[PDB]
Design an enzyme around this catalytic site. Sequence first.
Site, PDB file in Angstrom:
ATOM      1  N   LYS A 282       0.832  -1.202   0.000  1.00 12.68           N
ATOM      2  CA  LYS A 282       0.000   0.000   0.000  1.00 12.68           C
ATOM      3  C   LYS A 282       0.873   1.262   0.000  1.00 12.68           C
ATOM      4  O   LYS A 282       1.381   1.667   1.048  1.00 12.68           O
ATOM      5  CB  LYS A 282      -0.932  -0.010   1.219  1.00 12.68           C
TER       6      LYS A 282
ATOM      7  N   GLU B 141       9.437   0.493  10.967  1.00 13.50           N
ATOM      8  CA  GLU B 141      10.560   1.387  10.706  1.00 13.50           C
ATOM      9  C   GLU B 141      10.105   2.823  10.984  1.00 13.50           C
ATOM     10  O   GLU B 141       9.818   3.595  10.064  1.00 13.50           O
ATOM     11  CB  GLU B 141      11.080   1.216   9.270  1.00 13.50           C
TER      12      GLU B 141
ATOM     13  N   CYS C 267      13.278  10.049   7.296  1.00 15.00           N
ATOM     14  CA  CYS C 267      13.499   9.405   8.591  1.00 15.00           C
ATOM     15  C   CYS C 267      14.947   8.948   8.771  1.00 15.00           C
ATOM     16  O   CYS C 267      15.420   8.798   9.899  1.00 15.00           O
ATOM     17  CB  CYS C 267      12.549   8.217   8.762  1.00 15.00           C
TER      18      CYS C 267
ATOM     19  N   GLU D  84      11.629  16.345  16.208  1.00 16.12           N
ATOM     20  CA  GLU D  84      12.479  16.716  15.084  1.00 16.12           C
ATOM     21  C   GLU D  84      11.653  17.309  13.946  1.00 16.12           C
ATOM     22  O   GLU D  84      10.564  16.818  13.634  1.00 16.12           O
ATOM     23  CB  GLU D  84      13.312  15.532  14.592  1.00 16.12           C
TER      24      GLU D  84
END
Lengths: 474, 472, 472, 474
Positions: free
Chosen positions: A185, A261, A295, A392
């Site tokens: 997806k 992740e 990331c 962040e």
Amino acid sequence: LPSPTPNLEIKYTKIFINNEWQNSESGRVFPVYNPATGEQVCEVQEADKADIDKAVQAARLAFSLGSVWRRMDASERGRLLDKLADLVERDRAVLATMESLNGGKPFLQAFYVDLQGVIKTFRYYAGWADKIHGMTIPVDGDYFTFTRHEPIGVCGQIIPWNFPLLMFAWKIAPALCCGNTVVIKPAEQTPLSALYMGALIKEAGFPPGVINILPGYGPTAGAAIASHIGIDKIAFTGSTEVGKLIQEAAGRSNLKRVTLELGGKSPNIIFADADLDYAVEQAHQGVFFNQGQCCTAGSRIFVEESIYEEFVRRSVERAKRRVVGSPFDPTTEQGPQIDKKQYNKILELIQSGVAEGAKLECGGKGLGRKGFFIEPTVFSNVTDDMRIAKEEIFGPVQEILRFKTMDEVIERANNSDFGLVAAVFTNDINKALTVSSAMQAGTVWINCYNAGEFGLREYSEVKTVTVKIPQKNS
Amino acid sequence: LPSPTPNLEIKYTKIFINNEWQNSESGRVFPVYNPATGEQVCEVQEADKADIDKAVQAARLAFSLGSVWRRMDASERGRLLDKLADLVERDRAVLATMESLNGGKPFLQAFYVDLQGVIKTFRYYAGWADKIHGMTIPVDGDYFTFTRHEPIGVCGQIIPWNFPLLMFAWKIAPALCCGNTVVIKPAEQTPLSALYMGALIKEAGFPPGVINILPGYGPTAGAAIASHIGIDKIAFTGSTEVGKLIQEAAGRSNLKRVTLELGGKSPNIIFADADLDYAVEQAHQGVFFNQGQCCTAGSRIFVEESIYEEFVRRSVERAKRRVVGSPFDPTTEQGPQIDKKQYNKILELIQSGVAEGAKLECGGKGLGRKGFFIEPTVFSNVTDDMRIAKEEIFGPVQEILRFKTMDEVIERANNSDFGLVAAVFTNDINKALTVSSAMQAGTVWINCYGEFGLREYSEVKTVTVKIPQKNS
Amino acid sequence: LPSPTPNLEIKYTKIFINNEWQNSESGRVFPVYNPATGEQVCEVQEADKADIDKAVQAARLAFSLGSVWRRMDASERGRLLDKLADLVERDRAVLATMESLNGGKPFLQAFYVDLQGVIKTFRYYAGWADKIHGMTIPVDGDYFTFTRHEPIGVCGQIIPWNFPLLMFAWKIAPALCCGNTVVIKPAEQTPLSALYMGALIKEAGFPPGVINILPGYGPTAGAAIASHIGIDKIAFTGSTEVGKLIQEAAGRSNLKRVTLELGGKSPNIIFADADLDYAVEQAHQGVFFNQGQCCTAGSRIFVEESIYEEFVRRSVERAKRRVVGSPFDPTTEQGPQIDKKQYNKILELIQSGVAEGAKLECGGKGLGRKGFFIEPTVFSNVTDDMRIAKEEIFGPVQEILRFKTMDEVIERANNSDFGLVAAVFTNDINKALTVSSAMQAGTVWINCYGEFGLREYSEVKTVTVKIPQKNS
Amino acid sequence: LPSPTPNLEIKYTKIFINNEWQNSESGRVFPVYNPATGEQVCEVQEADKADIDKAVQAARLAFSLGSVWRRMDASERGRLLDKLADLVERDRAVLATMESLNGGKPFLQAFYVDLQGVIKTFRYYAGWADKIHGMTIPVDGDYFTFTRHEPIGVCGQIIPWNFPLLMFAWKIAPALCCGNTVVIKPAEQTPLSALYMGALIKEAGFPPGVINILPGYGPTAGAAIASHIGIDKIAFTGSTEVGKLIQEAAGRSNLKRVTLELGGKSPNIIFADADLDYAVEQAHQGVFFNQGQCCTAGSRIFVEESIYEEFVRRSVERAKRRVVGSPFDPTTEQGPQIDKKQYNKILELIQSGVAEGAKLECGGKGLGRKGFFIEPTVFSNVTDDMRIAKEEIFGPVQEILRFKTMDEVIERANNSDFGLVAAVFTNDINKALTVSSAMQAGTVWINCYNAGEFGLREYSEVKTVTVKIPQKNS
């Protein structure tokens, strides 16, 4: 001297299930926008729970114990991965054009970095397919035991809008290498590059149902994958509070194997003894890379007191000279941000740091009309307790912090929740080893910054078979 | 605060075959000398061709298909090894004493270094026994192929006098770990520490004929092993000239597997940025350790022009204060050399370096009458073409060579035939990595001085099965 | 329905050094014989000691520390191997025709068996290039050790005439996969297939000097590789009495690593419960494949007393129906033997068994003039002590032996010196598992006929770094 | 000829934290029963959230960068494990007795089977301690990348009452081998064997806070672990619905790594060509071993039509002679069940099977007043749809089913939810290899049933470190 293909057509807009292009069950269609101008490029079919159920049936069937995909020699599963790489290489010009158009990233970066990576990894996992070994174990008594690495089954895969194709490549390649069938997806903003891959998968000769690509939204199509009873494994990659809902929805459904992740801070540590020319440039391309929204990278930068004065001066001169504009323009280093949601989320955090203490060295506001452009931002005199330091920023904003001792940076850089990447700049062996070893990070870079065997361990499951032997000898 | 066992008795002097203590077939007996005084310690039984023949038959039987040693669980093979470490641990005092008395090595160093390494090794391989895994390969077609890692057979082993007990451990442990049977030949001068291990091997409860210890000379005992037709594998370690004679005599017999561990020069490289106080000390320990006579050591030390003056000046002061005397005396850093043959061979090479231009900074002569003591020797201004540079000295003699660029040392240190170990002293990451990667050596140490070990003691046996239908 | 390329002319008949086509230094040129008709196909440059020296220097340069082959990413060494496979795939018809004309093997077998293997291995070792991993070891004390898997250097390779191109592939592929430079020597009788690969090597984009091919005889070009001071490793495949001279020549040269792939018997064991239809056909193809002359297969077959009667009946009917003739003829199953030397050596051993006890069921003589054709031969009632049973025949002759018990075959099949390949046919688990395990063999096939391979083409390098403080 | 220690002293009943015996924070004390008689053995300190909090702090301290357990050599971690095995060996008599008295397991079985396993596991992982290897990868460009295998941190472990001491060893040993610290929660009905191990842990000289043992209940002590914000990893083994609450409560707290080890049916398949004498014996000792209450065991047995008549007739004679009684008595093959809750649950499922068609060959009823003995039970002519076939009976009840073809059993045995272990009895290679490969199980036994490296992959985390080098060579 490659250049983007003019008048780029978006030919593949339908849902890819069982090697067939199918419409949505509800009939609904969602829009995809060019982030460089704001203009609507095209429309894509919107998958939902009904669409997922068809895709799981297709993947489950393609995996049964008499399947073309199961009878296949492992060496040939790599061969279909190797031929997939050929097609991505042949269509290197057009895939980077989509990734530049849909994603927003500059074209030359999409050609020389993103797709290079995409091609590289497919060839890599093509090599692994027929090399995944088990073992024979000399257990006690008159027995003989061995293990097979076998495919898990139907694998749900959800990716973000960060590196639509690279994320696609980094998730599809390991799975197929191990003999799985994939229900993937892609992000609701960036499904085009993933959709074109559907055409190359059919063309490369992948058995029907092996890879099912389903474009759509997260709480609809993505949450349907997470709560699906017929899926063996989910692999998510994205944000933390979305990731928390994935493992929760998995534990209440069928207890499918969960891999996340998630994001998290990524500190760069720069010592005085490091060369200034290389340290500044590698840290500049380690925050602002892909518009800052990744990331893998990190905006947080710790500089030694001795070179702190010189470091800021070098950084501000790289921001006042960075070309920001059209993704198709060969001169542009920076593109636009992905969303209105994203554009506003960055400015909020910039104007947070302005009234909170840090010095606005350059930039701050948006660049202008059309697209979601933000002029390069550099902050000075940043402390740990600031909002910009804990949460962040996910854009073209870098923070420059001051540090004294080696023990100081270790405890300040380690102060983070699950998820860390480190980057040290030193020419001192003892310093580098100490810092890299004490870092509570998954990956630690030394004198560099840019983003294997353990990768495919999550995509196959052990099966230990033991046989009674008439008499054992060593 | 450990100390040697006074009035030591050498209880074990006979040949160890099939867990029995046998006299030599000829009846002949050879002497073993204390290198610190020249005195005769004891008399050991002398093995020869006849004696080796009996030892192989004991190992061949202990390796047969019905045998206890083959039927035994892998985890039990490591159990016995672990018990062997236990027994050495208990007898650490006396074994260190034997190693000191027989081999010359000062007592404390043999206790805290040598035997620590002995105990640790048996402990290490005890752990490997039941963890030697094969693999399952997905080979094309309707097949399923798997590999067993199986013991080779009778392994002949020959060790030098460098680290008598350590070399014994380093050889026994991996071989027994894989489930082989051993016929081991400890150097003629230092058989004592190996023969005591005979007792502890029986005491640990190793099946008879698994480890066969044979004290004796090179061309008698050793050459009989290398030419023996019933020995599956040989593992030699010592001088290159003797090593060449091993592989040649092995090929003209049965083509047995050969593992040579020869000498070879070992360059220490010291850049200016490294800390002097540490560099001088560890390089000093890099040459002088175990009387200088070790295959793992390196006599030639390259020093960057900048710090060259200071380094030599530091290197002399560590040699002028280096306490040389009795191995049993707790204060002494340096024991005597092993042989009269070695003692002379060293002295010859020093007077070569003297009459060839190198600067004799300190030492050069022997200490005194009785034993084989050479006072610590430092040579300055040494060049690559000198006799002392090419052939490495196997004693307490260090060379200090001048070097200019990094590109220079790499070529110069690479210039060796087959044996290389490296040692760099730097604080620069780029310098240390680029030197270690370019250095054509087996092992490279950075700022100082396993699994692949047991691969030579097992053989792969790949078996493939025909299956009715293949599914992934 | 693929056909041989009609007017195949040998374009590449020169020595391949440093990516260039060079003549012989002596100037001498040797002839290549078509074993199908006895005709001279063409003439190829005869390499010698002087030709070797140039090739070595060329391979040494392409391996030096600055070389393009050393800077190359490991994944791109995989890229050149995978591209080489493409070129073989593209010229699959051409290379199969060369292997049929020069080797003698039937064309369809060369296209579907020989060359498929060739391509598959180049694809298999392409994959390994950037996957050869070392390891990090948690050793005692404040240290950090890691291992590097590095190329050895210049690799000498000598292959027979058995599977000229497959043997080339099986030896070239792993060596390059590990970053080595190769000097290879194809058989005197079959150099053509190897030399065409030279054209594909340069076309693929291999750096100059990385792969050097040298066609010629044994004692000339072959021994010169074995006794070369600049070669770091030799890998030989062929007869046992030549391999004995390889190790010896290596030990008296530079002590280069020696890997031998010698001959040795290969017993088939067939039990009563096995499927007669499948067992008869697979054991028949387990002897007669590639005209019999293959080290990977074996002539001796043990059949259980119960099915011994029926086996002979089924075996003779597959030999009386086996079409033998021209390799280009699609209907032919068996081609000719390689040499006059081979042809005579086989007949010698056939008529040996006729007068020694074994019953001549069929065959025995040759087929006639032009080519070295032998009609399929079957011998019944064979014992262990016969000359045919010990010294294995390398041709189209199979022996059928009788066995009573399970403990009988294992002792009778095991009775061999260095080199064995087993093959069992059973539907009993306990029978198969106890036979395959007890069989002293390097490879065992059950009901039919990698990673460990590339280890002999790389060398370990342990690097250990001193650290400020160690934590788990 | 070993014997149980008479007049056994239960000396260790307190909470074990930082090598110190502590009373419970609440002060409460829970009872531990002898399942053979129902009589109360002793009283153990009752742990809760407060008690856990202290244990975690102890474990975290023992794991900090300065700690002895961190500074310790890898081999010295192996040393301590081996010394622990030494002490278990010395105390084999009492540890077996404690297991026999507390768990209900027959003494001679607990001495020779369970404690052999406890010793062999500490010995095994002692050997692994210094052999946990990383890798060096030849990654593209001028870089050098190596990986470290590092400990995760504070590991929370929860075990059931099945194999109180084996389960303890099986969790402690790998975790300690990798350098972690442990907070372990033994089952409320059998904490004694684990508490005794506390003393042996201190005696072996394990650093304080490396193993924290807390006896107590599920919802209190157990759930406190899965929720704690300072525990890095949790390993649970037990029932499925308790496991479903573990992965969920872990995802709501800190996203700690979750390893479940749930039960599930385990089909035995017996073909006609197999030797009857061996097959009936091993399949009987497959179901009835350790009172039938083990996740490793498997109640449902498929027998080929040809031998179905004989197999029942053989199995009924093996159950009629099966001596059941006192665990301390040397003759007895079968002990009592652990609980009244378990005793009741088994009986319910029996009369479920009786009322549903299956043939009660022998047993069914309990044995007498006191303890929880159920007489060996064999059900005949069982079908897949039946209540006893879906839910596995965790007691001494075997089920014998009939099957026609190989294709039939493979489909019938595969039909299960998540957990699976297979056992085939055949002398045909093609039958064994077809079934063993096709079976959707984790472990497959061939011609046996019985009591590695992949065990310690879950207790350490990979750390990649990549270095930029001046120039790369091969």
